[PDB]
């Protein structure tokens, strides 16, 4: 009836062998993830084609909880697939596999949420998605772009299934120890005792001296065999050294600075082995083979799923460039509009008065579109995601041209697994109407008004009101294309927590709509979740309820544990969070701030009687970034410290300053409003500017790296909005007096000029 | 069509999961065999039931040949099944699996040839069979009896499939590098390069200093964690240490004496871990559960396959005891006869004049039978193999009694997979007739005359004559129960080898009948193989031809390799063969013999002019036990040295002495005939007696575990048959004068008394 473990694994190998990939066996050495295997890191290099699929036990010493945490294990199992070169339809096959595994595709809600992979220690990165199945992550999907610092040619697709979580979803369990391996034996009886014993060894009694010795031994031997033109033993030695290093980390004996050195050593080793493998396969002549490659106008690019901000930017740029070139080509036109959704970027130009110029220039226009991150699937053409189809129609006549190996056509595609999986259009004026037939609104905004109206209806259904900040709403708008709101509830005991945990967990991670009582504003045990497509309601409700309860169970343990020590003690661990090498840790930054806050307050004309209180805040600034809460929930910075101090008994204004030391966290964020918070935020930003400008890597494409890009902007907005006079030069000098790095007058002048330029941008 | 690799593995896991065993995965640690896995060595202990099946890559550093030897690899793959407790029909399921794997059962010739397992370093042993499929070993089958020095209760069955050899049999290939993994990728392109690189590492450039270090580290850590009541990490550490030791051995740096010490350390470690695991599971309360348990007279015991000498001894003892107790019970009877075949021990008593005494005494009689080696399947009842059925019939009346959990009945069983797989008997006088209907003869002589007559017919068919020594004939007689001779041939180039290699390889290992030309006595390219049952002829002919060609290819390469360095150079490696700790190596024994042979010859009244020649033989005695020829072919001791000396140019008598230094090799073997050979054999046996009696390990239960008595009996037979006078005391004293171990007069007196007793037994 309901599935087990060994049935799932068997079905996966059968399916993936049936498509064309040869099933192999898991290596006899320990890895942290399947990508580390010598069947993947080595084999994706070179022109030889490569298809393979295998199971792998993944061992992570850092996750030991003695088997009490209901879903975290030190040993899990992954199923890994490598396709090369890109067959051209990997997403068809992945969902077709999910079909063959017993997961019902149309009935469940399948969501491809953006996620880029990265791994410096292998020197690899790629672009792809994380697959959610009704709330839970179940798979990772990726296109490799560079491995061992060598740009891969041709590109390969990597697909990774996580099985314990999948089975926890299908069988409806809440703890790993109840999953059934096979008839009459549950996961517990087989693996719980091994879990306990290995967790004890990983956490307490393992020997570190011998493991340092083994790191030395294996590094030496890897170099030795790399000199002798044998790459397989070299890479094997590398894997042994890496796993020993992880066990080294679990004990807590990894130095705060040592990790960079370890990372450098291991990465250089792996890259050398990759280079040698490539040369060696070159000497052999490549046995496996080689690679070889007026009427309305509607223009649509159809790719796979794009990130939201990419959807917005691409729509704007494409529309503007098309209008421009139409003007330069002296062709008259009517109104021009743009539309977009995660899988399509469309622009409609009405009453266009032409075929030859359109044919000769459309590839140029589409090539002209630029994104921050681009990738190749075949050939050297770049785009955000691989293009699959182009709907380029003038009236009833199709425009022929070539680009990205895809010919323009009259075909489109609708919702996944419906009757309108594909269709065609003969008349341009039917375009927006034909998509009306597929159940997808192609404009933006329509979706926003629909979502908000339906959410209001459903929430009023139980006498509550939704909370809808702008950013959450826009993200949800561009995460779907056919909304369907659903109401759910959860157990009431969780309402005992502080309000911040509840709302932040509901919003930041899962994208659900919290609802407060229409009267008295208290939290209601309700939430609204936006499904996409023709789902069956109770399945989605069950899944999402289970997920929410799991996440709130996590908090309700961490929270009690974090009630035992007083916030005063957590400050000690701020030495474990890195700011910059020359400036020290977060603890050093806080110690610098605490000895400079009083002068900043004096220069701001703040009342002196608040000086003893504000300094008391300075002793506990950011003392939450080392609590288990903000470790799991990043968005709760400061506010949780406010509540802790309230329980700890500190003044409310101390808590408000600890909170507003964060504001603004980003563009558009509300700005600090209490005077101690203003002083703390000013001091923090001044220390950041003085330290980073005095120590280096300052301007990086004006993007963000090291938080200098938008921190600078905030410094001023705070000063302007709060109507407080300030002396920039004196405060900068006073801060530099506290910086451990010597700061000359030239650095101060540069900072003054930079602040002046940023203010000029603001003013 | 014709099978591949992954199809075989997938089909095996499917079949064995369908029967009731849960399929698991290969640990990420390196083993030499699946029995070493912590899923088998640990899990067979205790009363908790256990069924499991998994694949495992087996890594043996000692087998590196750089991929040139057609069937030997450093890395192979085994499929392992563990059943516990004994389900009761493990032999049905194993053949039912070979059926599901695509091997045709009735058409091929399936043979269960005796082979006992042993593994001291784990402290385990068992009893079982090696499965031959038309000439080639393909599977091992075993009942465990004691693991980790703790007598198991209840007993478990272990089945081990070897897959590369199976696939080499089905596809019809001669080298591993052509087996097809999957469509369009052969085994070569995947694994040949890994083979070359790992073979280079295993043989030349690996570091031994670091591996000694790691042995020390892991032994220390295993002790450390054994003290702390965590057995899983302890056993894992043990496995790492053992594999490192094997890589240590491949380089050749294992001392001739050190291996015993390493063996002791590792065995003690494993036993301690097993004991701790047992106590730990005892503390838990056993979650998995607990174990809980006148008319003719024809008496047949039916077990599984028995070894030959066991068949003979059991027939004799059962017949004698039954007749005795019939006499003691004052019951009259006619003629009494015995019959036996590998699966049945039957005794027929004619015209027996009783049911109550037979019922009350038959279990006593059957229990009274003794064997050198016994085992249990359920309960503590012992027998050579587990009993399955007892055919105990008096006339038309069945005799009811209970023993070994099996009730007496009227049922029997015929040839495997025939129409008469089962039948029943109502009339006693039909017994030998009814088996006539099943094709099985039952006399132990009828079979001999049938085999010899048919062999003569077939060999005369091509104008040749068979070679039939007695021992080979009797072994073949009791290896089958329904003979069918088959003629085959082989390639003629192999006739260029010396005659000894050809005949010895054909006889000692495969049990085939060599045929010589009727004229001139030259070897003919023919042989006769005795198939059993209703086989299809050409299948068997193809299989056996391929096997013979493979073995002769191996023989010719080794022969060519050994025909370079002189028979004198090979003497240096005799330090690598161990005789006893206190007496030294084989080289030391040969040096002792060479300095005492002249005095032995003088005491025998041998002509002095032959003294220079005989001593020249003493310089090269057993110079073959270190040549690859006798390393692979044990039965060629001495004779190959004779041929080498002939090629080397030595006198024929020197070679004859080198040959007869071995005679007799066993009971019934011919005795040395030339005087130098007589002197050499006498000197060798005298040195053996003086060394072993002077150093220890007296005749153990009279079975000669190291030699001494069958050895001495050989000495006295040599002295008597050759009509040579001899002085035992003086020769013993002279030999003791050469032994590095101090030998007192008491030792000499004990040896003299022992020789006198053995002569008394002979005379």
UniProtKB/TrEMBL annotation, chains A, B:
The keyword Protein biosynthesis applies. It is an enzyme of class 6 (ligase). GO terms for molecular function: arginine-tRNA ligase activity; ATP binding; glycine-tRNA ligase activity. It is found in: Cytoplasm. One of its GO terms (biological process) is arginyl-tRNA aminoacylation. GO terms for cellular component: mitochondrion. Belongs to the class-II aminoacyl-tRNA synthetase family. This is glycine--tRNA ligase. The lineage of its organism: Eukaryota, Viridiplantae, Streptophyta, Embryophyta, Tracheophyta.
């Amino acid at each position: 009836s309901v599935l087990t473990f060994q049935q799932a694994i068997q079905r996966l190998q059968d399916y993936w062998a049936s498509v064309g990939c040869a099933v192999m066996q898991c290596s006899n050495t320990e890895v942290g993830a399947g990508t580390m295997n010598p069947l993947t890191f080595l084999r994706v290099l070179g022109p030889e084609p490569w298809n393979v699929a295998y199971v792998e036990p993944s061992i992570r010493p850092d996750d030991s909880r003695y088997g009490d945490n209901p879903n975290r294990l030190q040993r899990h199992t992954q199923f890994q697939v490598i396709l090369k070169p890109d067959p051209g339809n990997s997403q068809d096959l992945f969902l077709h596999s999910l079909s063959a595994l017993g997961i019902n595709v149309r009935e469940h809600d399948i969501r491809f949420v953006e996620d880029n992979w990265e791994s410096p220690v292998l020197g690899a990165w790629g672009l792809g998605w994380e697959v959610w199945m009704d709330g839970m992550e179940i798979t990772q999907f990726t296109y490799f772009q560079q491995s061992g610092s060598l740009p891969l040619l041709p590109v390969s697709v990597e697909i990774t299934y996580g099985l314990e979580r999948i089975l926890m979803s299908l069988q409806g369990v809440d703890h790993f120890k109840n999953i059934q391996y096979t008839k009459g034996i549950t996961y517990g009886e087989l693996f719980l005792e091994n879990e306990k014993e290995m967790s004890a060894y990983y956490l307490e009694h393992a020997n570190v001296d011998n493991i340092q010795k083994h790191f030395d031994d294996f590094e030496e031997e890897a170099r030795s065999l790399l000199s002798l033109w044998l790459p397989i033993p070299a890479y094997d030695h590398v894997l042994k050294a890496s796993h020993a290093f992880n066990i080294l980390d679990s004990r807590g004996f990894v130095g705060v600075t040592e990790r960079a050195r370890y990372f450098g050593r291991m990465r250089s080793l792996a890259r050398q082995c990759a280079q040698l493998w490539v040369k060696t396969r070159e000497n052999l002549g490549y046995p496996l083979g080689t690679y070889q490659e007026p009427r309305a106008f509607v223009l649509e690019i159809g790719t796979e799923e794009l990130p939201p901000h990419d959807v917005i930017e691409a729509t704007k740029q494409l529309e503007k460039s098309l209008i421009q070139i139409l003007e330069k080509r002296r062709l008259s036109h009517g109104k021009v509009r743009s539309y977009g959704t995660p899988r399509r970027l469309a622009v409609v130009v009405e009453n266009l008065n032409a075929d030859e110029v359109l044919t000769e220039d459309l590839p140029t226009i589409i090539s002209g579109i630029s994104f921050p991150k681009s990738m190749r699937w075949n050939s050297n053409i770049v785009f955000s995601r691989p293009i699959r189809w182009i709907f380029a129609l003038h009236g009833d006549l199709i425009v022929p041209f070539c680009f990205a190996g895809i010919s323009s056509g009259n075909q489109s595609c609708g919702l996944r697994n419906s009757s309108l999986a594909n269709f065609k259009v003969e008349a341009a004026e039917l375009y927006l109407h034909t998509l009306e037939k597929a159940g997808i609104l192609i404009d933006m905004q329509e979706r926003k008004q629909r979502i908000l109206h339906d959410s209001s209806i459903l929430a009023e259904g139980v006498g509550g009101d939704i909370i809808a900040p702008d950013s959450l709403v826009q993200e949800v708008i561009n995460l779907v294309e056919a909304p369907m709101p659903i109401i759910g509830r959860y157990d009431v005991s969780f309402l005992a927590l502080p309000k911040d945990v509840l709302i932040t967990v509901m919003q930041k991670h899962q994208k659900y709509f919290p609802v407060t009582s229409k009267t008295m504003g208290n939290l209601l045990p309700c939430f609204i979740t936006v499904a996409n497509g023709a789902i069956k309601e109770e399945v989605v409700r069950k899944g999402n309820e289970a997920v929410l309860r799991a996440r709130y169970e996590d908090a309700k343990f961490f929270y009690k544990m974090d009630t035992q020590k007083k916030l005063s003690e957590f400050r000690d661990q701020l030495s474990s969070i890195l700011f910059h090498e020359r400036l020290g840790t977060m603890l050093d930054k806080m110690k610098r701030v605490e000895n400079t806050v009083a002068e900043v307050a004096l220069l701001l004309g703040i009342n002196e009687k608040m000086i003893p209180a504000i300094k008391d805040a300075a002793a506990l600034a950011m003392s939450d970034l080392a609590t288990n809460i903000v470790t799991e929930f990043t968005s709760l910075a400061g506010i949780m410290a406010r509540h802790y101090a309230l329980r700890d008994g500190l003044s409310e204004q101390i808590a408000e300053a600890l909170f507003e030391i964060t504001l603004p966290r980003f563009s558009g964020d509300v700005f600090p409003k209490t005077d101690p918070g203003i002083v703390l935020a000013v001091t923090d930003r001044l220390d950041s500017l003085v330290g980073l400008f005095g120590a280096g890597c300052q301007p990086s494409s004006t993007n963000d790296p090291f938080g200098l890009r938008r921190i600078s902007y905030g410094l001023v907005q705070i000063l302007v909005e709060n109507k407080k006079n300030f002396d920039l030069t004196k405060a900068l000098t006073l801060v530099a007096e506290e910086q451990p790095i010597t700061i000359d007058s030239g650095v101060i002048d540069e900072v003054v000029q930079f602040v002046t330029r940023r203010l000029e941008q603001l003013l």
